[PDB]
Amino acid sequence: EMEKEFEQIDKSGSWAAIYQDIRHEASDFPCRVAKLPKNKNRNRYRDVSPFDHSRIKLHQEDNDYINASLIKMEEAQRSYILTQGPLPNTCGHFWEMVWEQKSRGVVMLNRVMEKGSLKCAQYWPQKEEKEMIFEDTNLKLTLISEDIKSYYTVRQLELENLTTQETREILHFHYTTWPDFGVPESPASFLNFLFKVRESGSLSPEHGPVVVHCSAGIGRSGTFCLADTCLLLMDKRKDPSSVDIKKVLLEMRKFRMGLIQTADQLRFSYLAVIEGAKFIMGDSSVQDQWKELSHEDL
Numbered sequence: 001e002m003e004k005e006f007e008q009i010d011k012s013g014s015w016a017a018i019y020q021d022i023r024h025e026a027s028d029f030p031c032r033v034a035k036l037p038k039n040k041n042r043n044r045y046r047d048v049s050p051f052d053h054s055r056i057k058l059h060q061e062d063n064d065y066i067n068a069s070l071i072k073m074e075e076a077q078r079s080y081i082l083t084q085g086p087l088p089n090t091c092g093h094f095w096e097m098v099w100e101q102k103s104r105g106v107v108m109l110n111r112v113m114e115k116g117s118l119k120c121a122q123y124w125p126q127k128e129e130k131e132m133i134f135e136d137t138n139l140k141l142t143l144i145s146e147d148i149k150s151y152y153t154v155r156q157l158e159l160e161n162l163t164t165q166e167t168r169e170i171l172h173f174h175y176t177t178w179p180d181f182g183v184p185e186s187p188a189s190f191l192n193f194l195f196k197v198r199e200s201g202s203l204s205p206e207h208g209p210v211v212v213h214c215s216a217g218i219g220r221s222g223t224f225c226l227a228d229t230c231l232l233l234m235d236k237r238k239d240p241s242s243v244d245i246k247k248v249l250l251e252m253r254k255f256r257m258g259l260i261q262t263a264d265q266l267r268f269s270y271l272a273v274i275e276g277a278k279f280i281m282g283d284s285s286v287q288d289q290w291k292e293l294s295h296e297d298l
């Protein structure tokens with residue numbers, strides 16, 4: 001019936017209003033640690049901070065801060081860690097979190113340079129022979145291989161705890177065609193990407209929460225996590241009718257502020273979910289159609 005509401009809202013162009021209702025009702029919690037003078041240079045955006053109750057703490061004794069939130073979806077049984085695009089001084093902190101939280105995958109939904117502006121540090125190696133060493137957190141990162149597609153790239157990295165010489169394989173999923181404050185070209189390409197992450201096991205419970213990020217870790221990241229959670233709930237009981245997307249987004253906003261930044265991203269979330277439902281309900285051949293429609297082939 002979410003599709004009914006879609007026709008309704010669309011029919012009466014009330015997405016801006018619907019979206020504003022969610023903002024008026026969104027949770028609001030203190031972000032004291034994020035605002036401490038010492039963590040000023042650890043935040044990319046003044047207006048984007050993690051709540052204290054759900055922030056990820058680095059296991060270091062010096063300063064345990066990092067702009068990241070653990071979005072823990074109870075009913076859905078899935079957790080994601082949303083974070084901002086790392087800054088030049090926080091890449092070490094970024095991989096420390098990945099290691100400490102035991103994440104297997106990292107989903108980047110933005111590009112390093114957007115609209116002629118640096119939206120994220122180049123926190124992973126681009127060439128196999130030039131690995132990166134993060135002196136502050138004592139970690140080493142090596143590009144092992146990368147599969148480049150038309151609008152997204154999947155990299156295989158090796159992360160090594162230089163202190164224990166223990167190594168882990170990290171899968172890096174990079175969506176390169178999602179405009180800042182924009183929406184995927186189509187839900188086909190989006191779902192194709194999402195399912196690719198799902199195929200990798202990165203979202204399994206046997207692994208730490210997958211780390212999701214865009215430039216701030218709220219706009220495009222929210223859109224991604226919302227569609228995934230909604231499709232998962234729908235899957236648990238095979239009942240599209242029992243999935244209240246607006247209510248799910250509100251449940252997510254209790255863990256991090258401003259998930260989904262525009263009324264169009266919200267509208268897209270609906271589209272993505274509705275289309276994704278086709279696969280969840282027994283039509284496994286739609287996944288191939290998405291792959292085709294996406295045109296991932298160079």
Ligand SMILES: COC(=O)c1c(O)cccc1OC/C=C/c1cccc(-c2onc(C(=O)O)c2CO)c1
Nearest residue numbers: 023045047048181214215216218219220257258261
């Ligand atoms: C629309 O606003 C809200 O929903 C909201 C709210 O209801 C309550 C409290 C705070 C809120 O937003 C705070 C952040 C503004 C804000 C400021 C600067 C950048 C971004 C941003 O968001 N997503 C991205 C991306 O990389 O895709 C970016 C990168 O440019 C958001």
